[PDB]
Every structure is written in structure tokens, then in C-alpha cells.
Design a protein around this nucleic acid. Structure first.
Lengths: 48, 103, 109, 142, 116
RNA sequence: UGAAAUAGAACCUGAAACCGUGUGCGUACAAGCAGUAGGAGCCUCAAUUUAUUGGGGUGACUGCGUACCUUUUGUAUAAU
RNA sequence: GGCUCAAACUAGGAGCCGAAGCUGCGGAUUUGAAACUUGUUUUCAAGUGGUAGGGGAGCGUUGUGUAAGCCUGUGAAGGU
């Protein structure tokens, strides 16, 4: 290894995790991918 | 003492040693461009109107510089629809100095 | 030169003092003192006190001729507000603001 | 090169006199409205008054076709409940002769500060004489 | 790794408010009102960037109509005459000549009139 | 006194809302989401041989133009 | 508003206006295509309204290493 500065993970290795509800531009704002009023949009929903 | 020329999809009424900014051209700075398709030359009292081009008449311009214009903010918003987008724009221009209007 | 005096903390609303300050702004020292001594408003005793202190400062600290002075600037700012409680009917309580004012006066030739 | 405006200080309003004798009301009114707006001028800019002063004589002699002299109704509301009032073209010509042509032109001018300023250049008189020989209007058959 | 957001929030709100200068009342003072005022200004500017191209041609056409009627025919017949004469001069330059060079516009009208 | 006192004790820094004072321009015949696109005039700085540009403030007058969110088949909505 | 051999209607004809449609000019970008070939370069073709939603690429913030570094009273952070 050269240095603790120049260590890259090797493109494709990492990905940014998704963050719901952080504005219009991120693609996951407001509802956060959940849709509208319904059971599956709620805070403890699942598929059973 | 003036002419009408076509540059960048637009038309311009030009006089000598006039600084005119037009659309971006593929010419270097200080390079001299000759417009030999002028539309009209009005030299004092003589009016030469080309149909569509005044034959023989020409104007030489000098490419003073190239640059970006004023930044423009483009704002798009769809009310009640969770839609907003912004972007910036700066149009490219060239500055020409009219050198002469050949009849 | 400009000689200042400040009367930070007058127990009165700045709104109630600005009416008095508007009538002495720009006047000469003598005319301003006349207006203040014959005003029926409570803000005038505060403004007169601050003005007299500014004139004293100009005479003593700065050695200026008082006969040629004038109220060059005057403004009233809001001070610290005391907060109190006023009972109302049906077991309800309103907050009361006891406002104070800061008076700044600058005399000058 | 740019497109310049008329620069109000540089604009001149010319005086013209029009004889409204037997002419059609609206056919004359459109011409007058265009002249008051300044549309006949190559310096026309819609935010500047580039018009001309129009002095109309024989305003009580303007004509309407059909049966409009007796059927053209002029309504106004006075601001009071039931306060709707109506008058005829012929009654209004007898009573306030200039108001027929003034009303026709006001309808054809734009509705705003500039339009109010351009209607102020319409000087219309019943009779053959106008008190504006000092301005020397030029006779304009329009 | 607690993040306090005051500094970034301050400069974001300051950006919007600095773009809301000149606006009356709360529209240049309070962010909640100013931010939608700035968005609406942007929307108007976007629409008016098209409508300007729309409005200046209306101005040029009115000026050319005045100029052609000053010596001869109407705007519609003038434009037909230019098209027949193969004169490529645009309405912007035409209105400029009508407003600033009456003799040249007279000669230009004479060409269109000779072509019909 | 202190390096500093708009470090003076409610005392480091001292934002915003909110309230003043001063200067410049506009505003008392004109109807509406208060902007936008144009645009006269005035004021002010810098170059320039001297009103000609450029930057800044203001904005007469003209066109266009019924907030945002949510929820909806659909909202300027007098729906939240 | 106003309009009556219309500025109405019927039947033709010729001009013109008219949109963010199309063309012109300049620029960005998605996909695919011939190559010094990983945006190394020049182009070409077809595209680029968008809610729910799916996919892609980034910005900024706090903290750790890099860092006993680098910057900083010849003025850091913050504020304007």
C-alpha cells in the first residue's frame, strides 16, 4: 500500500445507502417510496 | 454608412468600429471574419438592398473575445405535485468589432 | 462635533416616547427645552432629562457653546421588557409586557 | 442593435381637427382611437403616449345606421339599490352631445393610466367652432 | 457524530432571502414567505423568457405596419411584397429602419410595391 | 484601566424575527397573490477628454400573471 | 367598444397574424454506432413534459485516520 490517503475501494465495491424523506430532489422525499394512505404506508407495515 | 448582416440565426444592423456581441463562433481571438452575404448596405443616401444578398458588398469583423453572459436561473415548479427543479444557464457569445463595410 | 447622552431604561413604552421625540428632533436647544417643559406627556420628562444631560456633557466635557447647539439626532429604542401575569376570568392568565425604552440624544452645532 | 422606445421627452403630439358631420360613430371612433394611441407612428411603443391631439367638431352631428339612433341604449348604475338608468342615442345627443363620441372612443382605448392619459388628448365639441386656434390643428379627414 | 445544522441552515435561508431583495413586506423579510416568492419569480421569468420573444415581434410588426401605411400599402401587402422580392430582412431590422431611417424604409417599401 | 470597554458586569461572539433613526429614489385619478418581461426619468460611484459608457439604488408607464402544502376525479378555492 | 353595399350570413379567392409545434443559431445531456480508445478525442443517429414509483450520478454537514501534517494573533471558527 502507498498511504492511508490513497486507498480506494475499487469502483463498484461500495454504494450509497438510500435515505427516505430528505427532499424532492433525492427521489425519496415526502412519502419515501411508500405511496399514499394505506396499510403498507404505515409505520409498522409488512407483508405477512 | 451601415449594413445588415446575418450571424448566428439573427440579423444585425451594424456600423463601423461598433462592438457587437453575437452567438458563439468557431474563430480565434483577433481573427478577421468577412461577411460576404450582407442583406442591405445604406451608404449615406445610396440604398443597396440585396435580393437576398447584396452582391460584392462585404463587412470585415474582428473577433475580440469569447465569453459567457449573465447567469440565468431556470426554475420549474409544479404546484401540489412534489415537483421542483432548478438549473443554471450561461449563453456563449463572441464579441465582434466591425472593421469596414465595403459599399 | 456631536455630543451624546443615553437614557437606557426609561419605564415607559418606546411608542409613547416617539411622539415626544418627533416634536423635538431638529429643534434648537432652547425651543426643544420649551416644548419638553410644557408637554403634558410622561415621555417628555424622560426626553428632557436626557437632553439636559447631553447639553451638560457638551458644556462640560466638550466645551461647546450651548447657545449654538441643536438636537441633531434623537431616537427611542425598545429596552428590556418586564414580563408579568394578569389573571382573567374563568381561570385564565394573560402575559403582560411592561415595556421600557432607551433614549439616545445627540446635540451638535 | 436593439429596439428602442420613444422617450416621452422626445415625443411631439400634433394637433388635428376632424369634422364628425354625418360620419358613422364607430367607424370614426376607431380612427380617432388609433390616432390617440399613436399607432400610425413608427416610434409607437405601447408604454409611451405617442398619440396626437384630436379636436372633433360637429360632435352632435355624428351618425348611426339602422335603427340605432332610437335603439342604442346607454346604461349606467348610480351605486344605489335599483339605481340603473338608461338613455337613448338621440336623447343623449340632445342632452350631452359630446358623450356619444367620448363613450365610443373610451371603449376603444386601453383601460389604465396610459389610456386615461391618451383620452385626455381628445378635444370634442358640438358645433363648428373649437377654442384651439392657438394650437393650429391641421384638418384631418379620417 | 451529532450534527448541529444552524450554520448550513443560516446560509441556505440567507441565500433565499438575498434573492428576495426588493420585495414588499414579508416577501423580503421572512423566509417562509420569501422562498415561495422567489420560486414564483423564477416561474414568471421562465414563462416571460418565451413571452418576450412573443412580445417584441408584436412591437416590430406594429412599427412596420405604421411605416408601410405611412408610405403606401399595409403590413400584410408589404410582407408579401418583400417575400416576392426575395428580401430576407427580418422584422426586427425592418422596424428599426422604420423608426430610425425613413428614406431607407421608403425605398424598401417601393421595392415591395413594385413587386406587386 | 485594559491589547480590546458597541470586553463595563443582564459583560465572549452577538444571527433572525421584531422596532427605530438617517440618506437616495418612488408614491395622494388609481383597482386584485404584489412578481416577472420590458422601460422613461432621477440619484450615486469608476473610467473616459467630458454625459459616453459600465457598476449600484429607485421604478413613472406597458404586457403577462388567482400563494404554498396536503388531499383529491378535480382546488385561487369560500377544503386542510 | 362599436358594427348594417358589415365589423352579419352564404359561396369562393388572395395575403397576413398567430404556439414552448417546425426551422435557424448557440449550448448541455441519455442511449446506440466507425475508430490513439475506460470523457482521448471528432462526430453521427435517435431521444431529453411528468405524479406514484423504479434506476443512475453527485453536493454539503459532524466525527475518525491520513495529521506530531498543513493553515492560523501578519488573525481560526462563527457573523455580515
Amino acid at each position: 500500500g502507498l498511504r492511508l490517503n490513497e486507498l480506494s475501494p475499487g469502483v463498484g465495491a461500495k454504494k450509497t445507502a438510500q435515505r427516505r424523506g430528505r427532499g424532492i430532489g433525492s427521489g425519496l422525499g415526502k412519502t419515501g417510496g411508500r405511496g399514499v394512505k394505506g396499510q403498507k404506508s404505515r409505520s409498522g407495515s409488512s407483508i405477512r | 454608412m451601415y449594413a445588415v448582416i446575418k450571424t448566428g440565426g439573427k440579423q444585425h444592423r451594424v456600423v463601423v468600429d461598433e462592438l457587437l456581441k453575437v452567438e458563439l463562433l468557431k474563430a480565434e481571438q483577433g481573427e478577421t471574419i468577412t461577411f460576404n452575404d450582407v442583406l442591405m448596405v445604406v451608404d449615406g443616401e445610396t440604398v443597396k438592398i440585396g435580393q437576398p444578398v447584396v452582391d460584392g458588398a462585404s463587412v470585415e469583423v474582428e473577433v475580440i473575445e469569447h465569453g459567457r453572459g449573465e447567469k440565468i436561473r431556470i426554475v420549474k415548479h409544479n404546484r401540489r405535485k412534489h415537483y421542483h427543479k432548478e438549473q443554471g444557464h450561461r449563453q456563449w457569445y463572441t464579441l465582434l468589432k466591425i472593421k469596414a463595410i465595403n459599399a | 462635533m456631536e455630543v451624546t447622552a443615553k437614557l437606557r431604561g426609561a419605564a415607559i413604552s418606546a411608542q409613547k416616547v416617539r411622539l415626544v421625540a418627533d416634536e423635538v428632533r431638529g429643534k434648537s436647544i432652547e425651543r426643544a427645552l420649551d416644548i419638553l417643559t410644557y408637554s403634558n406627556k410622561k415621555g417628555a420628562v424622560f426626553v428632557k432629562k436626557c437632553l439636559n444631560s447631553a447639553i451638560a456633557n457638551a458644556e462640560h466635557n466638550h466645551g461647546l457653546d450651548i447657545d449654538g447647539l441643536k438636537v441633531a439626532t434623537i431616537y427611542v429604542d425598545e429596552g428590556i421588557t418586564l414580563k408579568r401575569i394578569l389573571p382573567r376570568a374563568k381561570g385564565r392568565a394573560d402575559r403582560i409586557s411592561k415595556r421600557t425604552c432607551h433614549i439616545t440624544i445627540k446635540v451638535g452645532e | 442593435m436593439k429596439t428602442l422606445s420613444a422617450k416621452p421627452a422626445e415625443v411631439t403630439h400634433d394637433w388635428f381637427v376632424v369634422d364628425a358631420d354625418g360620419k358613422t360613430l364607430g367607424r370614426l371612433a376607431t380612427q380617432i382611437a388609433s390616432r390617440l394611441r399613436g399607432k400610425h407612428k413608427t416610434n409607437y411603443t405601447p408604454h409611451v403616449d405617442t398619440g396626437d391631439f384630436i379636436v372633433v367638431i360637429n360632435a352632435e352631428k355624428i351618425a348611426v345606421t339602422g335603427k340605432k339612433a332610437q335603439d342604442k341604449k346607454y346604461y349606467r348604475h348610480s351605486g344605489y339599490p335599483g339605481g340603473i338608468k338608461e338613455t337613448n342615442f338621440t336623447k343623449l345627443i340632445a342632452h350631452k352631445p359630446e358623450d356619444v363620441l367620448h363613450k365610443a372612443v373610451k371603449g376603444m382605448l386601453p383601460k389604465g393610466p396610459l389610456g386615461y392619459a391618451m383620452i385626455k388628448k381628445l378635444k370634442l365639441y358640438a358645433g363648428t367652432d373649437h377654442p384651439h386656434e392657438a394650437q393650429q390643428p391641421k384638418e384631418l379627414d379620417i | 457524530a451529532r450534527v448541529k445544522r444552524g450554520v448550513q441552515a443560516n446560509r441556505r435561508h440567507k441565500k433565499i432571502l438575498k434573492r428576495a431583495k426588493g420585495y414588499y413586506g414579508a416577501r423580503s423579510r421572512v423566509y417562509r414567505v420569501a422562498v415561495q416568492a422567489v420560486t414564483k419569480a423564477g416561474q414568471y421569468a421562465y414563462r416571460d423568457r418565451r413571452n418576450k420573444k412573443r412580445t417584441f415581434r408584436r412591437l416590430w410588426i406594429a412599427r412596420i405596419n405604421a411605416g408601410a401605411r405611412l408610405n403606401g400599402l399595409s403590413y400584410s401587402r408589404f410582407i408579401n411584397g418583400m417575400k416576392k422580392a426575395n428580401i430576407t430582412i427580418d422584422r426586427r431590422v425592418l422596424a428599426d429602419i422604420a423608426m430610425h431611417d425613413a428614406a431607407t424604409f421608403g425605398a424598401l417599401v417601393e421595392k415591395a410595391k413594385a413587386e406587386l
